[PDB]
Amino acid sequence: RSPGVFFDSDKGKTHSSGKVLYNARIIPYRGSWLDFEFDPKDNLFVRID
Amino acid sequence: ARVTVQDAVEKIGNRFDLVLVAARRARQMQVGGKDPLVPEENDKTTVIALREIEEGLINNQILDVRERQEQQEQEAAEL
Amino acid sequence: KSDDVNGRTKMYKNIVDGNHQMEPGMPESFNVLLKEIRSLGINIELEDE
Amino acid sequence: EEFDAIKIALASPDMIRSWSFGEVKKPETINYRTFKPERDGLFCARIFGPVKDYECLCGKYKRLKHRGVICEKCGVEVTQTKVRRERMGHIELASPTAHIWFLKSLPSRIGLLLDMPLRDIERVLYFESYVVIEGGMTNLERQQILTEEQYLDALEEFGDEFDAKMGAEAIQALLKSMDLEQECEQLREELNETNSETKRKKLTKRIKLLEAFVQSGNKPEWMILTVLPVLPPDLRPLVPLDGGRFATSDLNDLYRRVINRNNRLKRLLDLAAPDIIVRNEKRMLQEAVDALLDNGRRGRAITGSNKRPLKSLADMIKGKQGRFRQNLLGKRVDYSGRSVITVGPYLRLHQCGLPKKMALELFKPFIYGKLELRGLATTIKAAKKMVEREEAVVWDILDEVIREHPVLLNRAPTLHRLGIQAFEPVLIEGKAIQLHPLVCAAYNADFDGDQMAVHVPLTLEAQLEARALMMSTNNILSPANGEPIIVPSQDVVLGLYYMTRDCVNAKGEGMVLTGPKEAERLYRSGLASLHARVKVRITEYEKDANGELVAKTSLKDTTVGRAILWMIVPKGLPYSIVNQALGKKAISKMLNTCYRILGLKPTVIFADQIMYTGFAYAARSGASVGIDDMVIPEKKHEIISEAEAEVAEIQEQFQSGLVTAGERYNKVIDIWAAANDRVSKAMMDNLQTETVINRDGQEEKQVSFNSIYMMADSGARGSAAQIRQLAGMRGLMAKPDGSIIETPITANFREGLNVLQYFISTHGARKGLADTALKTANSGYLTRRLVDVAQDLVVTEDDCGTHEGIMMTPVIEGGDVKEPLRDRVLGRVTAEDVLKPGTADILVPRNTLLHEQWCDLLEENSVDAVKVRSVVSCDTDFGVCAHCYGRDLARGHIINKGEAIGVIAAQSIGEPGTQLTMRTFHIGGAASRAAAESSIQVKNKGSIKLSNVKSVVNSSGKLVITSRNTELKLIDEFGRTKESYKVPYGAVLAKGDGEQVAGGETVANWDPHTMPVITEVSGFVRFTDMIDGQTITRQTDELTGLSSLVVLDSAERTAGGKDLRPALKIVDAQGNDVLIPGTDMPAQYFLPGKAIVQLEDGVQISSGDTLARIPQESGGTKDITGGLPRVADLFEARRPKEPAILAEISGIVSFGKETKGKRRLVITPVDGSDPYEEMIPKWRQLNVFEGERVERGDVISDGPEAPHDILRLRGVHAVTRYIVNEVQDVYRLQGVKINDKHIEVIVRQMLRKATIVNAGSSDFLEGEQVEYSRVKIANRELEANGKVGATYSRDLLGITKASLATESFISAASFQETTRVLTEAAVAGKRDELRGLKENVIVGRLIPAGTGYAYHQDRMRRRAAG
Amino acid sequence: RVLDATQLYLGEIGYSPLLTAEEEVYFARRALRGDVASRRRMIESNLRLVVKIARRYGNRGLALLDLIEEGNLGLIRAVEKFDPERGFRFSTYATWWIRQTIERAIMNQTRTIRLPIHIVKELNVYLRTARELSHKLDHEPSAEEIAEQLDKPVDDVSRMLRLNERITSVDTPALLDILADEKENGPEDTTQDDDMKQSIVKWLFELNAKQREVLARRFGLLGYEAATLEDVGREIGLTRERVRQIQVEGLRRLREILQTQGLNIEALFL
DNA sequence: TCCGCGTCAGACTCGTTTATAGCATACGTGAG
DNA sequence: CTCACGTATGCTATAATGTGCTGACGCGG
Ligand SMILES: Nc1nc2c(ncn2[C@H]2CC[C@@H](COP(=O)(O)OP(=O)(O)OP(=O)(O)O)O2)c(=O)[nH]1
Ligand SMILES: [Mg+2]
Ligand SMILES: [Mg+2]
Ligand SMILES: [Zn+2]
DSSP, rough: OSEEEEEEEESOOSSSTTOOOOEEEEEOOOSSOEEEEEEETOOEEEEEE | SSSOOOOHHHHOOOOOHHHHHHHHHHHHHIIIIOOOOOOOOOHHHHHHHHHHHHTTTOOOHHHHHHHHHHHHHHHHHHO | OOOOOHHHHHHHHHHHHHHOOOOOOOOHHHHHHHHHHTTTTEEEEEEEE | EEEEOOOOOOEHHHHHHHHHHEOOOOOOOSSSOOOSSSTTTOOOOOHHHHHSTTTOEEEEEESSSSSSOTTTTTTOOOOOOGGTTOOOEEEEEEEEEOHHHHHHSOOOSHHHHHHHHHHHHHHHHSSEEEEEEEESTSSSSSSSOOOOHHHHHHHHHHHHEEEEEEEEEEHHHHHHHOOOHHHHHHHHHHHHHHHHHHHHHHHHHHHHHHHHHHHHHHHGGEEEEEEEEEOGGSSSSSSOOOOEEEEOOOHHHHHHHHHHHHHHHHHHHHHOOOOHHHHHHHHHHHHHHHHHSSSTSHHHHHHHOSSOOOOOOHHHHTTTTTTTIIIISSOOOSSSSEEEEEEETTTHHHHHEEEEEHHHHTTTTHOOOHHTTTTOOOOHHHHHHHHHTTOOOHHHHHHHHHHTTOOOEOOOOOSSSEEEEEEEEEEEESSEEEOOOGGHHHTOOOOOOOOOEEEOOHHHHHHHHHHTTBBBOOOOOSSSSSBBSSOTTTHHHHHHHHHOOSSSTTTTTTEEESHHEEEEEOOOSOOOOTTTEEEEEEEEEEEEESSSSEEEEEEEEEEEEHHHHTSSSSSSSOHHHSOOOOOHHHHHHHHHHHHHHHHHHHHHHHHHHHHHHHHHHHHHHHHOOGGGSSSSTHHHHHHHHHHHHHHHHHHHHHHHOOOHHHHHHHHHHHHHHHHHHHHHHHHHHEEEEEEEEEEEEEEEEEEOOOOHHHHHHHHHSSOHHHHHHHEEEEEEEETTTSSSSSSSOOOOTTOOOEEEEEHHHHHHHHHHHHHHHHHHHHHHHHHHHHHHHSSSSEESSOOOOOOOOOOOOOOOOOSSSSSHHHHHTTTTOOOTOOOOOSSSSSOOOSSOOOOHHHHHHHHTTOOOEEEEETTTTOOOOSEHHHHOOOOEETTTTEEETTTTTTHHHHHHHHHHHHHHHHHHHOOSSOOOOOOOOOOOOOOSSSEEEEEEEOOEEOTTTEEEEEOOSEEEEEOOOSSOOEEEEEEEEEEEESSSSTTTEEETTTEEESSSOOOEEEEEEEEEEEEEOOTTTEEEEEEOOTTOOOEEEEEEEETTTTTTTTTOEEEEEOOSSSSOOOBBBTTTTTTEEEOOTTTTOOSSSSSOOOOTTTEEEEEEOOOOOOHHHHHHHHHHHTTTTTTOOOOOBSSSSSSEEEEEEEEEEEEEEEOSSOOSSSOOOBOOOOOSSSSSSSSSSOOOTTTOOOOOOOOOHHHHTOHHHHHHHHHHHHOOOOOOHTTTOOHHHHHHHHHHTOOOOEEEEEESSSSOOTOEEEHHHHHHHHHHHHHOOOOSOOOOOEOOOOHHHHHHHHHHHHHHHHHHHHHHHHHHHHHHHOOOOOHHHHHHHOOOOOSSSSSHHHHHHHHHTTTTTO | OOOHHHHHHHHHTTTTTOOOOOHHHHHHHHHTTHHHEEEEHHHHHHHHHHHHHHHHSSSSSSSSHHHHHHHHHHHHHHHHOSSSSSSSSSHHHHHHHHHHHHHHHHTTTSSSOOHHHHHHHHHHHHHHHHHHHHHHHSSSSOOOHHHHHTTOOOHHHHHHHHHOOOEEEEEEEOOOHHHHOOSOOOOOHHHHHHHHHHHHHHHHTTTTTHHHHHHHHHHSSSSSSOOOHHHHHHHHOOOHHHHHHEEEEEEHHHHHHHHHGGTTTTOOOO
C-alpha cells in the first residue's frame, strides 16, 4: 500500500444497525500511523498508531 | 473365495464374524499345523479358511465343539 | 506400525517366524501425552479394572 | 497395566512431589567439555536416570549384570536409559504461583469460586493492590481491594485484628479459608427467597461448581502452585546435530527461566531485600511459570531466538498440531510407501500393479521368513544381504509371498471410506502403481500425476478384514446412496455407445443372423457395420418363481453391435437392456439390475467385461476431435444482434426514468440468459441431428455421429454446458463477488476470444480457483465436526421392537417429482401395518425389509404416505437397531450389527460438499443461471388445489394472492397429488380454487424482481411517520416533476427517525381508517429497507393494488459456496435473525395489552387455565387474527422456523424432517444424492441431551442437563418401582456443542478447546470409561465396532464376573 | 490498565527519594553500623542507577527485568562494602558493582550449555581482535589470522569459536520430526541380535562341553561377570597356555558352522 | 471486547545474530 | 600424598540516579 492518505469505510460489519463508518488512514513510509474514524453516533475520533 | 468372499458371508452372515472365524481357523493351520479339509492347491491360510467356510465345514460353533473335544482328550491324558 | 516399541519388534520377529500375530501394547505418544499433562500439574491416572 | 478408565483431577503439591525423583535446583544442562549431565541440573542423571543403558555417570558400574545398583560416588541408578523418558522431577517455588489455566481460562475457576472478578484477582497477583482475607471487624469484610494508600489507613486505625495480603499468598489463603459446604447452603438459601431469572443460572452454576468441587475431592488451594513438576529429559531433549552443534526443546529455555528467577528469589529472601525488589522478583517468577505452562495466554508471549514465541507445555497438547490430532488420532506408519499412479486397463477389478522394488521392500520380513523355512538363508543378516544383491531366487520367493496377500491403496483426500480399498497386488517391472479404471471414481483418481499410499495388512486378521470388508470387488455400491460407485466412464462409455447406436442402412441392412456369434463374425469379417439394422435370434434367460432360470428364444430387431454386447451380458437379464443405444446413465442401471438379480460375483465379472469391450471398441472406432467437429449455428449473429439492440434500448431507457441499478441488472441478465439458451438450442438442433443420410433410396433424418455430439450424448465427458462454450456462446460470466457481469461473452472458444473478452473471463476463472483452495477448508471442517458428533453411534441391537416412525412423503417440488417416495422408502423397515388404500386386509408387515420387489408393488397401488422406522425414533440406548436403520446401502442388504453407522453418515454428508467445492469450480468459468421464475405453466391437465392461501380479488377480476406460504398442487382424476408449484406473495392467479385447467395453460403470473406490498382494503393512502430525510428520501424530475420515495432503513437513517416505523396507512374519503374485513385491525403496511414507492400521498387506491416495490436483488450464484453455509447453519441449530413465532399451547386466544404498537398476544387455553403472554414487536405483523382454536406450533409470524421451537412444541419427527428437507434442498440443487437416514443419524446425535424438571430417586432437581438414554433408563426402573416421577424435555444441541457435551472428555479434548475441556474435567475429577471410538483409537486399542464389537462385548460381560 | 510487571516496578522506583552527598554519608555510616532503615533507603534510592545501567546493556542476551534484578544484587554488595570515610561519591563505586554482577550473570545464564567465565573472557579478546582485523582487512577474520595476532595456538582459537556456535531450537522450524532417535535400533537390527543370541545358545550345545564352558563363563553368555584370562583359568583349574588351547579349538568348531552355514558369515565381506 | 474455530496428505531448499575488563584469592576434585 | 588444573567468587572509588514495535481476516458465542 503506497504511503499517502487512504479513505476507507467498514461497509456495515460493525453494528447490525448497519451504519457505514468512514475512516481516514495516513500512511507514512516511516513513522506512526495517523487514523481518523467515525463512530455510530457521528463523533470524529483519532487513533494514534 | 479366490476373487470374492460373498458366498462365505452368505454361510455365516455377519461380515465381522466371518473374519473372526476365518482368522481362528487360519491360526490353527498357521500354528498348530492343523490339516486343511480342502486340498491346499497352493492357497494361503486366509483363503483356505474361506473355502472351508463357503462349503460349510468351518463355523464358530463347530470350532468350539472340536476345541472342547481335543481339550477333554488332553484332560483325560493328564489324569 | 507406529509408536508401540515392544510391539513393533515383537511383531517383526513373529512375521519372520511366520506367525502373523499382533500382540499389541501401548503407544508411546500416549505415555508422552500423560507426562505433558502431569507437567501442567494435572494428576491424570490410569484406573485399573 | 490393562485398565478400565482414566480420571483427571487437580494436582496436590504433595502429589506433584510423589512423581518427582528430586528437586532440580540448577539451570545447568550439561558440561560443555564432557557433554554429560550437570550435578542437580535439568538433565541431572541423579534425578532422571542414566544416559546410557545399565551404566552410572562416573562409569564405575557397567553391563546388564548391575541392576538398580545406585552408584554411591556419582549417585546414578544403573537401569535402562528408557527411564529418562518416564521419571519426573520438581521445583520448590519460593512464592506461591497461580496456575494460568484455572485463572485465565474462561469462565475461570478461581474467580467463579471466590465470586470475585478477574480484574480484582490480577491487581492482587501483580502486586498492585491488597485484598482483605478476613476481618472479624465488619469494618472491612472479605475480598475488598485496598490500594497502597488504602492499606496504610486501616493499618494504623484497626490493624492486626484485620488480615489483608497481596500476591498469590493472599489468594491461596483466601481459597484455604473458604468453606465449600457453608457457601453451598448460603447460596441455596438465596435461590429460595428471590430467584431472579438470569442470576438463577449463575447462582446454580456456582452451586454446581461447589458441589462438584467437594465430590471431586479437589482442594481450591491447589489451583495455586507451591511445587512445580519437571518434564522428563527425553521429552525435552538436547541432542547433537551431525555438525557438532546441539539442538534443544524450548521447554528447556522456559524451565531455565523459572529456575533462575526462583533461585534469585530464594537469594533475595536470604538477604532480607527491600520489599519493592522482592515484589518485582515474585512478578517475574509468576511470569516465568505462566510462560512455561501456557505462553501467550498471559498477554505477550516470550519470544526466543528468531522472534517466534517459545513453544510451551500447553502448546504441545492443544493445537491441531498438538499431540492429539497429529500423533494420536493419526500417525506415520511402517510397511507404507507411495508412488505415481497410472492405468492398468488389463487388470481385473480386484487387482493393482505393484512395482517390483516397492513390493520387495514392503514385504521384507515375509521374505526373510520364507527364506529361512526353505533353508536358502542360514540367518536373517544373510537373507538381508541376498535381498540387497537382489538375487534371482529372491524374486521367485517374493512372488510366492505376494500371492493372495491384499494391499491397501489410499488417495488423499480420504473423504469417504472408499478412499481406502484393498487389492490383490500384481508384481510389475517399473516404478508406477497401476490402478484399475473402474475404481478411479471412488478415489477421484485421474492419472495426471496423482500419487497413492500403499499399506500392507500384516496380521491374518488384518488380511481377512482387507479381503472381506475392504476389497474393491466387495465395495461396489456407495455407502452414501444406494447406487454403484463402480461405473464405466470416458473411453468405456464412448465405446459401448459407438457399438449400440444405430445408423441408416450401412453395411448389410436387414440381414438375418443365427445368434450374436454370426454377428461378431460378420462385423470382424467386414461385411457389416456395428450400426447396421438387422434381426438376430438371441436366447435370453429369465429367472422363474424359484432359483431355476428359464430359457426363451425369440427374434429381435436391434443392431449388430448390440447383439455382440449381448455376448458379455450374463444370463438372467433381458435383451431389452442392450437393445437401446447405451450411455453411462443406462450402463449404471445395467450393473445395478445385474447386481440385484444375479448377485455380486456375476456383476464383478460383467463390470470387467464391459470395461474391456468398451475400451476395445472405443479404440477400433477411432473417435477424435477436429475443429470442424465444433459446429457454429448459422443463426447466432441474428439472435445476438437482436438481443444486443434490445439491451441497448433498455440502457437508453435507463437515463429516462423507469430503472434502478437492480431492475436493469435483472432485465439485462434475463435478456442475455434467454439469448444464450436460444443460441445453445440452435447449436444442439444443428448438431444432435442435422444428419442428412440417404436411406436405401431417398433422404432421411437420423442422429448425428459428430464426434463431440457423441461424447456429450453418451455422457462420456463434456456436457451440453461445455459444448455451449465451444461451439455456441460462452455466456454471462460471474464476478468473484457472485454478482454477474452485465456484458456477456458473445464469442466461443472455436471463434476465439478477444483481449477484452479474455480479460473479463479471468475474474470468474480465478475466483473459481481461489474457491477450491480456500473453501475446501470449511467443507472439511464440517466433515470433521460431523464425524466427532457421530463417532459413538454403532448398530447395537437387531430389533428394539418399536412401532414409532417419521411419516415420509414423496418430495414433489417443481412440477416433476424431485425425489419419489419409492426411492425414499427403498431399503427401509416399514411399520404400523402399512396396507393398501382399501382398509380390509394387511399388505405389508410391521417388521420386514423393503426390497425392490415390495417397492414395485407399492407403485402399482400408488401408496402416497408410509410410516417407516427411523434412527431418530429408535429406543435403543447407547446405539441404534438394525431395523430402525434398514439396509446398509453399500452392501445391498440389512445392516450388520456392530457397523459404525455414525462415521459413515458424517463421511457421506461431508464428501459431496468437499468434492463439489474443487469440482464445479475449476471445471466451469461462467455462471449459467436462469432466474425467469415469472409464470407457473402447468404440464398436465387437472384441477387447481391451493393449500395455505389468503388472497384478495382485485379490480381486474383476478385473484391476487396475499399469503406468504402458498402451495398450488395439480390433482388428477382419482385424487392423487402429482405436481406442486410454490406460488409467491403478490401473484396474479389465472383461475381460483378447484377450477379445471388444460395441458400447457398458464395458471399464475408474477414479477420475480420486486416483491410488491399488496393492500387488502380499498380507499385513500396516508403517509404515517414518513418524514423526509428522517425516514425516507425524496427524488424529483423535470418539466412537471415526478417525485419518488425510497424508504431509508435504520442503516442510513438518522438518530431522530430510529424509533419511527414508516408505513402506508389506508384511510377512506372522510379520512377515517378503513378496517381489514371482519377484524379490529386498521389497514397499515409497514415499509422495509428501500421500499421504492412511486405514487405520492392522497391517491385513491382500489384493493389488490401494488403500493410499494421492495427491490429483490438475487446476486446468488447456484454453487455450494452459498449452499454449504446453509447446511452448516442447519446442523449447528442456529436460530435465524427473525424467527417465526409459534403457539406454545393449544387453546383460544384474544388480545390484551399493547406498548404503543408492540403486541402482547395473550393465549388463554380451553382446558389449561394458566395463560401464556408474549411481548411482540409492533412492525411484526400476524398471520392469525383473533379467536381461533390453534394447536401447538401454529405459525403466527412471517419468517423462517427455528429448529429449537419445532422440537420443543411439535416434536422429534417434525424437527428431524425439517432439517432433512432443508439440508437436502441444498445438496439436491447441486445434484447430490445422499440418503435421508444419514442426516437422521446426525440429527439423533444432535438430540442426545435433555433437561429435567423435578426430582426422581436420583439427583435431578431443577434443570440439570442429562443424556436422554440415561434418564430413560432411570424412568424404566422408576415406573416399575415407583419413587418420584420426573418430567423431562429433550434439548437440541448443534454439532459443536453436542460433541463437547459427550460424557467422554478424551473425545471433547481431541475435538477442540482442549485447554478448557481439561480444566473443567480436572476440577470435576471426571472419569472417562472409554466407551467411544476416538477414545479407544487414542489409547491404541480395538475399536468398539466392526471386528472389535465381538471382542468388546466379550470384555463387557467379563465385567459381570472375572 | 497498568498490567506490565516492568511498568509497575518502574512506577514504584520513581516514587523513591533521591539522595544527596551529606545524606549518603549520614545513611552510609548508620548502614555499615547495621541500620535496617538506612540500608533499605540507600538501596531503594539508588535503584534508578541500576535501571540506567540495565537499559544500557539491552539487546545483548538477558532481558531488562532480568538485568534489573541481577543489577540490584550488585547494588546490595555495593551498600555492604561502601566506604563513607573516603571522600569519593557512592554512584561511582556502585557503578562498578552493578556492571560486574550484570556482566557475570549474562556470561552464565544466557548460554544454554553453561560456558565458563575463563573461556568467555578469552573469547572476548578473540572477538575484539576480529573487529580490528575486519576494519583494516575489508574481509572478515580467519581463525589462523586471529591466532597470528594473539600469538596463540590455532587449535585453541578454533575450539573457542566452536563454543561461540549458538543453539538451534528443535521445535523452531519441525526439526524434531526430521531428526531420528540414534540410540534406538530399528526392529530390523533388534531382530538380527535376537537371531544371533538364540543361535549362540544352540551353538553352545553343538560343540564340546569343555570349550563352550570356557566361552560361556568368559564372555558372560550363560554366566554373569565376564571373567578375564586368569579368572577362567583359576575356575576350571586350567593354565594360561590351556586358555589359548581351548580358544584355538573353539574357533575351529566355529569354522565348521561357517563352511556348513557360512553362507551368512562370508557375506560379512562387502 | 475476547476467544474459539478455519481439509488432508505429499516434494525440495535454506537456516541456526550479539555483546562483555582483567586479575587475585577461594573451592574442590583428579592424577601421578 | 601433594600439586596442578579447572572452576568460582572477589574487588575496582571523578560523577553518572525515569523506561520505551508493527499494525489489516471473519464468523459465532
Ligand atoms: N482436498 C483437496 N483435494 C484436491 C485438491 N486439488 C485436487 N484435489 C483432489 C480432488 C479432485 C482430484 C482431481 O483434481 P482435478 O483438478 O484434476 O479435478 P477433477 O475432478 O479430476 O476434474 P477434471 O475433469 O477437470 O480433471 O484431486 C485440493 O486442493 N484439495
Ligand atoms: Mg485433472
Ligand atoms: Mg489430478
Ligand atoms: Zn558412578
